[PDB]
Amino acid sequence: APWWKSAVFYQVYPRSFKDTNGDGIGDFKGLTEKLDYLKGLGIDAIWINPHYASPNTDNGYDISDYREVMKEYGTMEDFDRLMAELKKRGMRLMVDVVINHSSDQHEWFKSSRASKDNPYRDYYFWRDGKDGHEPNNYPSFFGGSAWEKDPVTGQYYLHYLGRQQPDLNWDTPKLREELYAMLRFWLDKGVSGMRFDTVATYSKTPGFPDLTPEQMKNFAEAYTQGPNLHRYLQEMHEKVFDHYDAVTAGEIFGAPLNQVPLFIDSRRKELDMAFTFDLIRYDRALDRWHTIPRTLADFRQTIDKVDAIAGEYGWNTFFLGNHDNPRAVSHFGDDRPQWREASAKALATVTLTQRGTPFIFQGDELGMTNYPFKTLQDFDDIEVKGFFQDYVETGKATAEELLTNVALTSRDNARTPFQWDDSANAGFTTGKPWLKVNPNYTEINAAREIGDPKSVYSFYRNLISIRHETPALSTGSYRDIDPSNADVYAYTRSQDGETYLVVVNFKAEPRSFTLPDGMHIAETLIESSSPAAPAAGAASLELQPWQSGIYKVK
Ligand SMILES: [Ca+2]
């Protein structure tokens, strides 16, 4: 089994991790200075968000030169030093790869847009408008049409994401070759992994027909149905990843779950691991800014479906948080002051006992929460400006309705600065932070958590040790004990004759749990929020509100 199947990854959003020069923005020196912190937590590998030259209309996801580092993060020597310090500690780097689209400030795009006849014209998608308007009805994730007119040629260019993020044209062989050369530039430096942003949208539909009214309400899914998608992923593997030893993982956003095996079945020679969004978006409405109430039965049934698509030859990541989603404890747990620590531990237990490679998002090991936004001016999020354009300016919603609802879903909840201690701005910066620090940093910070054996951080650290010592808990089979139960989540992990039971109360009330007939507790590995372990031989358990536990059975 490869190293990445048993590894524990941590995701660093460098903009918000640690600033070392007072400009309010996190940087490479900051990340490098905190490597001992991450080593001591027990992290094997870090995934960093984009670190390349960028105008930052979308905080690194609009890249203007793929072979230079972002000015705010440091220099190429700072990147090289990050790499060297990771290696000293036996840790690996995964970088973010953003090749569905570039910045409109990339030299390819400046050349492409200049005339119709130039060698870069087909690096992007340029099309004539139809019947007085855009080439078709495609919407953009970030507001308005996915087509933007350029008066120089009178044609429109495609952008699924922001106006400043034109889509790259994978149908053009010279363009594919340029992307492959660029990937080699980074892999030659020794990076150990690559995470592919919106990997399912690379192939565009020939002819760009209109979306149907059905497709229009779920456009994210129509954009994943390009006919050449797997041909491109296979060619990238053959020309690039076959020559290296790096792991690959795809952000498969918008794809129907039954198509996921095409990306990750190891026999297909495409990607190694999947990030899927069925679970993290399980309670999101189609418009992406409302929430729909769900129960633990929905949570566990979604997991069971995602596990089944990995089958025998594929592999899943597991995550409860990332830079595009609200905080795990607020979203899946209960972030009220009395339940925040109990429920954040319960979610740690879930995260670290799933079948797949877990990714811990920066700050979740502290039990960091959603941010108390007060006005729409408190959001940096360009996705929020897009909802304002699509919903407030059009009269569909008031500003107060947008505010109330996006406060719960906005990705800026995940982007507030990491809370290091209780000094000014939580020790993130000596200057003014680019996004405000959550005021609860006085109660939620790394310095106070590390020093307390009973903290959320200590629980994460202890779980990571246990997982490392117990192979069933990464590579073992997974079986949900009762998918209909909406109160208590329970499942087994087994490998090579060893079976482990995981039991997690999702109610803020006491609950009982009866083990399957014949199964008995043999040993308790760890519990959260419990006054007493069960007795060896127990056929049932009494659970405190939000209690979690791992037990060896038989
Ligand atoms: Ca800085």
Contact 96, 49 (CB under 8 A): yes
For 28, 241, 373, 378, the CA distances from 434, given in Å and listed in that order, are: 16, 36, 15, 11
* Strand, helix or coil for residue 127: strand
Domains of the chain: 1-102+173-476 (3.20.20.80), 103-172 (3.90.400.10), 477-554 (2.60.40.1180)
Tokens 């405190």 belong to residue? 544
* Strand, helix or coil for residue 513: strand
Alpha helices, DSSP H, located in 357-476:
382-387, 399-409, 446-450, 456-469, 472-475
The residue annotated as part of the active site, out of 104, 167, 197, 335, is 197
* Strand, helix or coil for residue 524: strand
User: Is there a catalytic annotation at residue 393?
Assistant: no
Q: How far, in Å, from the CA of 503 to the mean position of ligand 1?
A: 43
Rounded Cα distance between 327 and 324, Å, is 10
**Number of CB atoms found within 10 A of residue 4's CB:** 22
Total count of residues recorded for the chain? 554
* Strand, helix or coil for residue 527: strand
The residue annotated as part of the active site, out of 148, 251, 365, 383, is 251
Q: How far, in Å, from the CA of 18 to the mean position of ligand 1?
A: 8
Backbone angles phi, psi at 305, to 5 degrees: -65, -45
Rounded Cα distance between 329 and 342, Å, is 10
Q: How far, in Å, from the CA of 552 to the mean position of ligand 1?
A: 47
Joined together, the tokens standing for residue 548 give 């979690």
Amino acid identity, residue 127?
Answer: R
Strands 193-196 and 92-97: parallel
For 87, 193, 402, the CA distances from 244, given in Å and listed in that order, are: 17, 10, 46
What is the DSSP annotation of 61-100?
Answer: SS-SEEEEE-TTT--HHHHHHHHHHHHHTT-EEEEEE--S
Rounded Cα distance between 491 and 499, Å, is 10
Contact 262, 270 (CB under 8 A): yes
Binding site for Ca(2+): which residues?
19, 21, 23, 25, 27
Q: How far, in Å, from the CA of 421 to the mean position of ligand 1?
A: 18
Binding site: which residues?
19, 21, 23, 25, 27
CA–chain centroid gap for 432, Å, is: 27
Rounded Cα distance between 400 and 392, Å, is 9
Tokens 């059905």 belong to residue? 214
Q: How far, in Å, from the CA of 367 to the mean position of ligand 1?
A: 25
Joined together, the tokens standing for residue 20 give 């070392």
Q: How far, in Å, from the CA of 428 to the mean position of ligand 1?
A: 10
Q: How far, in Å, from the CA of 451 to the mean position of ligand 1?
A: 27
Closest-CA residue to 323 (of 6, 50, 7): 50
Q: For 285-424, where are the E strands, in sequence order?
A: 317-318, 357-361
Q: How far, in Å, from the CA of 430 to the mean position of ligand 1?
A: 10
CA–chain centroid gap for 457, Å, is: 20
Rounded Cα distance between 177 and 244, Å, is 17
User: Is there a catalytic annotation at residue 251?
Assistant: yes
List beta partners, residue 511. Answer: 543
Tokens 């008031």 belong to residue? 398
Rounded Cα distance between 164 and 28, Å, is 25
Joined together, the tokens standing for residue 344 give 């954040």
Closest-CA residue to 67 (of 81, 54, 56, 49): 54
Scored b (16 or more CB within 10 A) or e, 274-296 reads bbbbbbbbbbbeeeebeeeeeeb
Q: How was this structure determined?
A: X-ray
The residues near 391 (Cβ < 8 Å, ≥ 6 apart) are 289, 397, 402
Joined together, the tokens standing for residue 119 give 């060698």
Joined together, the tokens standing for residue 332 give 């899946």
* Strand, helix or coil for residue 489: strand
Closest-CA residue to 466 (of 362, 549, 366): 549
How buried is 469 (Cβ within 10 angstroms: 0-12 exposed, 13-18 middle, 19+ buried)?
exposed
Rounded Cα distance between 224 and 277, Å, is 13
Contact 508, 546 (CB under 8 A): yes
Tokens 């830079």 belong to residue? 323
* Strand, helix or coil for residue 475: helix
Q: Could you tell me the strand order of the sheet in which 155-158 lies?
A: 126-127, 155-158, 147-150
Tokens 């959603």 belong to residue? 370
Q: Which residues have CB atoms below 5 A from the ion given as ligand 1? A: 19, 21, 23, 25, 27
CA–chain centroid gap for 148, Å, is: 28
Resolution in A: 2.0
Q: How far, in Å, from the CA of 254 to the mean position of ligand 1?
A: 34
Greatest extent of the chain over all pairs of C-alpha atoms, in Å: 78
Q: How far, in Å, from the CA of 28 to the mean position of ligand 1?
A: 8
Joined together, the tokens standing for residue 146 give 């996915």
